[PDB]
Amino acid sequence: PKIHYRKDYKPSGFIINQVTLNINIHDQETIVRSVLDMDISKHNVGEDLVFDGVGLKINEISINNKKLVEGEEYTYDNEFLTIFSKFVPKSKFAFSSEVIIHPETNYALTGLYKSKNIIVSQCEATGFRRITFFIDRPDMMAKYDVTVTADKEKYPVLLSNGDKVNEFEIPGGRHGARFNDPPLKPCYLFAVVAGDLKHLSATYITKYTKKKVELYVFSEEKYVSKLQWALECLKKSMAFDEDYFGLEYDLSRLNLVAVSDFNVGAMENKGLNIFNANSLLASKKNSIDFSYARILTVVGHEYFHQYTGNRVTLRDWFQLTLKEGLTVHRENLFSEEMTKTVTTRLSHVDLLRSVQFLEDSSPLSHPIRPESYVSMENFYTTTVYDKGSEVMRMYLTILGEEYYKKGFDIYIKKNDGNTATCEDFNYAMEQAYKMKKADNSANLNQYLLWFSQSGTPHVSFKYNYDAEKKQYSIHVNQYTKPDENQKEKKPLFIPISVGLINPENGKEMISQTTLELTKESDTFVFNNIAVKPIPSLFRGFSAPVYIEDQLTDEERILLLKYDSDAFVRYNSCTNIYMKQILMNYNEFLKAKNEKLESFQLTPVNAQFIDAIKYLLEDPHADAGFKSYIVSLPQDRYIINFVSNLDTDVLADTKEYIYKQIGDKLNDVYYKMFKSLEAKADDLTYFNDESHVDFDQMNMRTLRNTLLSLLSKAQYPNILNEIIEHSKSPYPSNWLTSLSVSAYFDKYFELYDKTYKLSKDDELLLQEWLKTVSRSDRKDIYEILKKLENEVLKDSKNPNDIRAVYLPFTNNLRRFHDISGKGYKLIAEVITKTDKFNPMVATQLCEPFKLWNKLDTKRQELMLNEMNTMLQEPQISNNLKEYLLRLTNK
Numbered sequence: 001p002k003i004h005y006r007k008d009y010k011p012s013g014f015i016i017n018q019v020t021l022n023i024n025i026h027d028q029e030t031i032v033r034s035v036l037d038m039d040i041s042k043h044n045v046g047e048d049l050v051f052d053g054v055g056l057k058i059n060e061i062s063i064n065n066k067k068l069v070e071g072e073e074y075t076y077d078n079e080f081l082t083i084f085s086k087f088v089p090k091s092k093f094a095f096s097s098e099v100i101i102h103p104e105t106n107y108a109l110t111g112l113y114k115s116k117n118i119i120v121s122q123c124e125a126t127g128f129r130r131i132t133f134f135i136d137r138p139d140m141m142a143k144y145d146v147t148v149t150a151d152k153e154k155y156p157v158l159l160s161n162g163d164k165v166n167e168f169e170i171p172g173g174r175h176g177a178r179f180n181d182p183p184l185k186p187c188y189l190f191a192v193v194a195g196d197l198k199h200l201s202a203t204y205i206t207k208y209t210k211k212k213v214e215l216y217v218f219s220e221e222k223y224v225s226k227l228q229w230a231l232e233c234l235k236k237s238m239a240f241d242e243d244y245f246g247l248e249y250d251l252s253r254l255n256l257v258a259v260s261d262f263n264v265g266a267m268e269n270k271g272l273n274i275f276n277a278n279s280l281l282a283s284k285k286n287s288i289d290f291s292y293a294r295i296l297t298v299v300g301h302e303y304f305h306q307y308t309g310n311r312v313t314l315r316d317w318f319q320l321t322l323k324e325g326l327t328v329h330r331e332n333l334f335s336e337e338m339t340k341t342v343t344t345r346l347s348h349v350d351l352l353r354s355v356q357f358l359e360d361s362s363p364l365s366h367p368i369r370p371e372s373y374v375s376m377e378n379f380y381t382t383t384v385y386d387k388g389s390e391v392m393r394m395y396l397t398i399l400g401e402e403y404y405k406k407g408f409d410i411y412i413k414k415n416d417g418n419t420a421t422c423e424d425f426n427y428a429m430e431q432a433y434k435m436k437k438a439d440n441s442a443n444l445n446q447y448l449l450w451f452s453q454s455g456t457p458h459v460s461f462k463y464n465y466d467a468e469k470k471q472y473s474i475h476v477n478q479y480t481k482p483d484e485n486q487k488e489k490k491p492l493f494i495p496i497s498v499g500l501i502n503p504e505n506g507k508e509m510i511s512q513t514t515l516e517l518t519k520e521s522d523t524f525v526f527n528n529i530a531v532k533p534i535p536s537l538f539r540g541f542s543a544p545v546y547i548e549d550q551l552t553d554e555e556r557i558l559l560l561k562y563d564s565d566a567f568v569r570y571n572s573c574t575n576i577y578m579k580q581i582l583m584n585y586n587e588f589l590k591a592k593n594e595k596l597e598s599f600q601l602t603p604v605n606a607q608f609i610d611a612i613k614y615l616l617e618d619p620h621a622d623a624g625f626k627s628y629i630v631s632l633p634q635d636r637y638i639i640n641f642v643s644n645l646d647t648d649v650l651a652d653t654k655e656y657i658y659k660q661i662g663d664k665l666n667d668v669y670y671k672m673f674k675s676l677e678a679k680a681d682d683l684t685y686f687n688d689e690s691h692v693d694f695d696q697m698n699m700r701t702l703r704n705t706l707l708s709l710l711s712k713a714q715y716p717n718i719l720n721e722i723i724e725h726s727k728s729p730y731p732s733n734w735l736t737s738l739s740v741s742a743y744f745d746k747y748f749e750l751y752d753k754t755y756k757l758s759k760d761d762e763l764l765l766q767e768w769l770k771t772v773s774r775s776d777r778k779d780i781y782e783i784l785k786k787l788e789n790e791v792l793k794d795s796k797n798p799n800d801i802r803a804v805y806l807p808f809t810n811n812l813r814r815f816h817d818i819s820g821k822g823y824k825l826i827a828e829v830i831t832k833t834d835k836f837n838p839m840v841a842t843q844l845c846e847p848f849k850l851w852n853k854l855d856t857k858r859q860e861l862m863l864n865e866m867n868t869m870l871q872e873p874q875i876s877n878n879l880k881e882y883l884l885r886l887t888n889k
């Protein structure tokens, strides 16, 4: 297994200047002819010419139109085509090849493949080599001239990058289209699509150049009525890049294409963005509310890549976070501006501190720019994406908007049209830093440790107030635990956005302030502080760290009620919950270990419950924020704070705390569930796909959260509400009715009702599958078997497999059944999936990421299943390398 090392980067001895492709799609095979106009680079030392080429069937290869012969002049081992250096020209030459590939049976969904009746490519990271021979790395930038031919009846729509410059008929019912893309691009941005596609289209006029851009959104005919929101989102994305960053689209046309079979969310191929249908298609009758923010996010993300990834690209794959972290950050700015809801930022923090913090304390922990890799298909991690985004966001926090925009424009102007590295971005940010500090000696050299140092920093606080001096001090300490990547961790540049709240009136005591912590510890002193404040720390979650606020629950309640910052209010609530959870967990654990016949549990803080009621009853307070405060922290957030976590004890702990709060607040919950109905379920715009109301969707989130709490509590006659909820036109509601009916004898009645509502829309049926999978049912294992036999069967669609199994893996009580039956089940699915889709098989390993954080019995059970998977003779490269790293082999 070849290990690639970041320090080993060297430019190629060759240059590829022009790619001319002929892709001829036939019924049982696809023939790919390619001419590469090539040259010898200044770094050449007379080496063999080695092309990447994976799974290609060679018909012929030639240099300068002279056919090469296997064995004497070249070897091919199904991975590398080697042309011996004595046959490689010493000046400009043409390399040509004709190969046969087979998209119909390409179930791994990389390279050229068939998704239902659509032929589609996926080339990032190293998938272009599955289509034709290439030096398949992003610094080999070239011009592309691409012709595609196909049966006209089956494939009337043909698309590739660039301008369509010819269309022509071919004998035998075939036709072709030629696409010329003159701007240089790396091969991972190549794409081709062929199918019987239907579309919506619009014309966008850019802000400054006033160029007309044609926008096309494509799907199969059955779902063309689900394209409208995506088109709206694309217009919004273009306007935001113009308005915030001053950046306009440079091409005449942008196509977005939905396909049913896709390994991830979407892909930014230049002018031809290709999407998982679940991240492009929606309608109000056939989609849950989550689809609307998802499509906005993913359309936005792929659009923002046109600058941060496409026009400025990567020198090498170790720079992945330079385009992904930065594009996630750009999408976050966009979505926060579009939704105007605090829950957009809170949702990203919620994901980071559960999923990404877990990764960063697991054996898989890596920095956002790793030092090595074996599988690029395993490289696309929440660390690279989401911690990367927080690292890109910290530059904006440090510089402020005006200087951040100045630094970003420096980055774009200096690197437009070229490859770049993480240092290039830090350099541009540093220039803005010098401007802001009015100090040409200022630098961001320490900031580079965010790219190289793995692990989550811990930031802790102590305070001092001198009432006579009116002097307040915040003493701050930072610590990152040593791990496999650094034995000694260095202090980072941590920006701490802070406010000081007057506890008597709730008002701000200082102006906007960002503490710059650059040492292992520092003391920040504030004068003329007239009363002892409550500090509001890491406003907006200003650095990706474990925050240890050292506040009392009384102080946290005051912030929860009266602070100005949504994150600090949410975090103060989180911290109150965590203190309770750890305390009750240990009490339950003691009772279990000591086999106690009786014991006591510490009750939930009554002033905390009073504060929740106060916020819930405030009509001016935000419904999305309300849904967060009545929900306990994510299990994957909690696990970062408990060694040898017994999942049964945690489930008992959560149950006690929810029952404590519900015993006091259930009448409030029910009153709110009823009073929110009119605005939450308003149908005024149900048949307008352009009208999306994120506040209204948050009201539905709150109602569906409250209904779940009330159903679990067996609130009197709540089943009446559940049944009426099942009749709502909104899938978010009627799928919720299925979920919350798990606690009643009507579950299988609603199972059948909602199945019939879902079965005729591919994506809605996947949402139904997720709802069943996550149902809190004692018979969930029997239910999963029913889904397997009746709905899923032997589908190779990743959306189907992920929908059936991943939600169930979050069932704390049942997935972690002490028999190990849940670990056995998912391991069987992983091994089965690995036969045809190694990338998705590795995604299905997600529940095992926390294996060494569980109690010792469950550690043993998970490890046994992982070792069983590792012993499969046919295990893929992806899955083997992932499980070897995860099990510390």
Ligand SMILES: O=C(CC1CCCC1)N[C@@H](C(=O)NO)c1ccc(-c2cc(F)c(F)c(F)c2)cc1
Pocket (backbone or CB within 6 Å): 109, 110, 122, 124, 125, 126, 127, 263, 264, 265, 266, 267, 268, 297, 298, 301, 302, 305, 324, 376, 377, 378, 380, 839
């Ligand atoms: O969809 C997402 C996550 C979403 C983005 C917005 C909301 C979260 N991310 C994709 C992305 O960054 N798009 O810009 C992304 C695209 C291709 C690959 C990828 C595919 C393969 F088939 C490979 F083999 C491979 F090595 C790599 C992995 C990820």
Ligand SMILES: [Mg+2]
Pocket (backbone or CB within 6 Å): 054, 055, 056, 057, 100, 101, 102
């Ligand atoms: Mg092949």
Ligand SMILES: [Mg+2]
Pocket (backbone or CB within 6 Å): 207, 239, 242
């Ligand atoms: Mg405008």
Ligand SMILES: [Mg+2]
Pocket (backbone or CB within 6 Å): 260, 762, 797
């Ligand atoms: Mg299907």
Ligand SMILES: [Zn+2]
Pocket (backbone or CB within 6 Å): 268, 301, 305, 323, 324, 327
């Ligand atoms: Zn991306």
